[PDB]
Ligand code: CLA
Ligand code: CLA
């Protein structure tokens with residue numbers, strides 16, 4: 001069959017499933033951005049923007 | 058026009074001090090020969106401020122405003138005591154008894170709760 005590095009080539013002539021794969025990628029990136037922001041909020045110390053700003057943390 | 062408990066209950070007015078109308082800009086003569094007392098001292102807090110502690114020793118350590126989380130449980134009321142008239146003409150309230158304490162919890166930014174015994178005990 002297809003080699004491992006060509007598995008996604010099944011989408012080339014399938015616009016509906018290309019859209020679906022792109023939607024899933026978009027869901028993963030948007031889900032990363034939310035989960036990254038929640039991780040940062042859970043750990044950010046906001047109490048000193050002079051000597052402990054976000055870029056030190 | 059005087060209210061009852063069923064008018065007041067669950068409205069939050071029980072945590073309020075009584076008010077005097079805007080017209081009452083008068084004056085109350087303290088006869089030095091006669092003794093006085095306080096029938097009711099009410100204190101209704103509106104603003105609780107907590108001083109921050111910046112870890113630096115120096116800096117601007119100002120009082121930050123907080124959010125009350127323990128609801129309308131805050132006023133001290135029904136406080137009684139003797140209002141003495143001193144020798145030099147001054148009046149000294151000595152507090153005797155009353156509802157003179159309320160535990161209060163306020164919350165700073167970041168979620169730190171600050172419990173305090175808001176009081177005028179003695
Ligand atoms: C928009 C970016 C993009 C998209 C949509 C594609 C799409 C495609 N690539 Mg291409 N490619 C790209 C960028 C892209 N590529 C880049 C940046 C490189 C250099 C690294 C390549 C080098 C490349 C080669 C050499 C080949 C392809 C192939 C393909 C086709 C099949 C992919 C597959 O089945 O792998 C399936 C992948 C796996 C089963 C596992 C991959 C795991 C990788 C190695 C590490 C983990 C990645 C990680 C999970 C994701 C991080 C994302 C990152 C951007 C942050 C598909 C059309 C193949 C092709 O043309 O077939 C005819 C092929 O041979 N690509
Ligand atoms: C943006 C991500 C993405 C999307 C939308 C697709 C989409 C697709 N894949 Mg591809 N693929 C991907 C990434 C992706 N893939 C990665 C990272 C790998 C390497 C594991 C592959 C390897 C792969 C193979 C071998 C095959 C496909 C196939 C397909 C198609 C059918 C679905 C399927 O069987 O997947 C299979 C299921 C997966 C790939 C699940 C992903 C597994 C990774 C590890 C994520 C698991 C999540 C996990 C809970 C996270 C753990 C966190 C950790 C810190 C603990 C569909 C077009 C099939 C196909 O149609 O080929 C003809 C197929 O046979 N994919």
Ligand code: CLA
Pocket residue numbers: 015018019022023024026
């Ligand atoms: C004229 C109307 C129109 C509009 C508004 C778009 C808009 C879009 N298309 Mg395109 N496209 C069009 C015509 C249009 N297209 C036509 C006629 C074709 C040929 C059939 C295509 C073929 C095409 C392909 C193959 C792909 C796109 C993709 C995209 C999206 C990329 C950006 C994205 O995902 O952001 C992020 C999304 C959001 C922030 C949310 C947006 C919410 C949407 C607008 C509303 C959802 C409800 C709505 C009823 C669903 C249908 C909308 C549809 C018309 C796009 C974007 C929504 C890509 C895609 O789908 O990526 C996932 C993609 O792979 N388009």
Ligand code: CLA
Pocket residue numbers: 008025028029032
């Ligand atoms: C500009 C932004 C951008 C672009 C162009 C891409 C492009 C791509 N991403 Mg996406 N992604 C992005 C932002 C982007 N990403 C962000 C911000 C996130 C959140 C972290 C993701 C999360 C994400 C996931 C979870 C996945 C993708 C995948 C993909 C690939 C899908 C097509 C494919 O089959 O390639 C075929 C694969 C390749 C061409 C290999 C790409 C190699 C990359 C570029 C770098 C090499 C990584 C290295 C080998 C291993 C890293 C260390 C390891 C320990 C993880 C494509 C290369 C998917 C994928 O790779 O499927 C296999 C996939 O599963 N992305």
Ligand code: CLA
Pocket residue numbers: 026027029030032033034036037
């Ligand atoms: C629906 C609308 C929407 C809105 C208002 C936001 C808003 C935000 N996003 Mg989110 N996001 C969204 C959808 C949205 N997002 C979707 C669908 C995804 C999945 C793809 C994400 C994935 C995502 C990630 C991974 C991250 C964000 C982040 C953010 C924050 C910073 C934005 C930023 O720096 O981008 C900068 C944007 C650009 C620089 C855009 C570049 C545009 C390029 C140059 C266009 C190039 C091609 C163009 C077509 C050329 C022709 C142009 C023509 C005019 C001539 C902001 C709160 C960041 C964050 O803080 O997360 C918590 C962040 O890391 N978002």
Ligand SMILES: CCCCCCCCCCCCCCCC(=O)OC[C@H](CO[C@@H]1O[C@H](CS(=O)(=O)O)[C@@H](O)[C@H](O)[C@H]1O)OC(=O)CCCCCCCCCCCCCCC
Pocket residue numbers: 027028031
């Ligand atoms: C930590 C380990 C545990 C993690 C558990 C996570 C749950 C996943 C485990 C269960 C996997 C079940 C897949 C196999 C069942 C099935 O047949 O496939 C169901 C479908 C197709 O349906 C199918 O379609 C097929 C035909 S076709 O593909 O449409 O052509 C047909 O064969 C079939 O009858 C029909 O059902 O295929 C799949 O969806 C691809 C495999 C699932 C990949 C799992 C990825 C995890 C989900 C994404 C989570 C991140 C999202 C964040 C962004 C929002």
Ligand SMILES: CCCCCCCCCCCCCCCC(=O)OC[C@H](COP(=O)(O)OC[C@@H](O)CO)OC(=O)CCCCCCCCCCCCCCC
Pocket residue numbers: 002003004005
């Ligand atoms: C976030 C989630 C991430 C998902 C996890 C997925 C990660 C994917 C991992 C893929 C790795 C694939 C490796 C496939 C390996 C593999 O399958 O090779 C065989 C394959 C050749 O395949 P053909 O095209 O012959 O097809 C056969 C097919 O059956 C393959 O499916 O070659 C390639 O894949 C090209 C890459 C060359 C790589 C060869 C490297 C070997 C060198 C050894 C180096 C070590 C010694 C160094 C000493 C100095």
Ligand SMILES: CCCCCCCCCCCCCCCC(=O)OC[C@H](COP(=O)(O)OC[C@@H](O)CO)OC(=O)CCCCCCCCCCCCCCC
Pocket residue numbers: 005006
């Ligand atoms: C589609 C996947 C592509 C993988 C991206 C590789 C990025 C490498 C950087 C660029 C150097 C490229 C020179 C390649 C040379 C080249 O041009 O190759 C092209 C080749 C496809 O070529 P053809 O279709 O001609 O196939 C030749 C085969 O038939 C073998 O004879 O692509 C590969 O084989 C992709 C596999 C590379 C596999 C790389 C190993 C991935 C290891 C990942 C391990 C990750 C750890 C995972 C932890 C979770």
Ligand SMILES: CC1=C(/C=C/C(C)=C/C=C/C(C)=C/C=C/C=C(C)/C=C/C=C(C)/C=C/C2=C(C)CCCC2(C)C)C(C)(C)CCC1
Pocket residue numbers: 028029030031032035
């Ligand atoms: C369904 C649904 C829902 C939910 C959703 C969710 C909850 C989601 C989540 C999501 C998420 C939570 C996601 C996340 C994602 C993530 C990712 C996607 C990541 C990625 C990663 C990577 C890619 C990395 C890589 C690396 C490493 C590992 C090391 C170093 C290097 C690098 C960085 C490259 C709701 C209810 C809302 C709505 C309705 C429906």
Ligand SMILES: CC1=C(/C=C/C(C)=C/C=C/C(C)=C/C=C/C=C(C)/C=C/C=C(C)/C=C/C2=C(C)CCCC2(C)C)C(C)(C)CCC1
Pocket residue numbers: 032035036037039
């Ligand atoms: C409709 C319906 C439903 C629903 C379903 C759904 C739709 C689901 C989905 C689900 C999902 C969709 C899931 C998801 C998952 C995810 C995950 C699992 C993720 C993970 C992630 C991670 C792991 C993270 C990490 C990180 C990052 C990325 C950055 C920052 C840091 C940290 C580390 C945090 C049900 C059945 C209920 C029932 C009824 C009907």
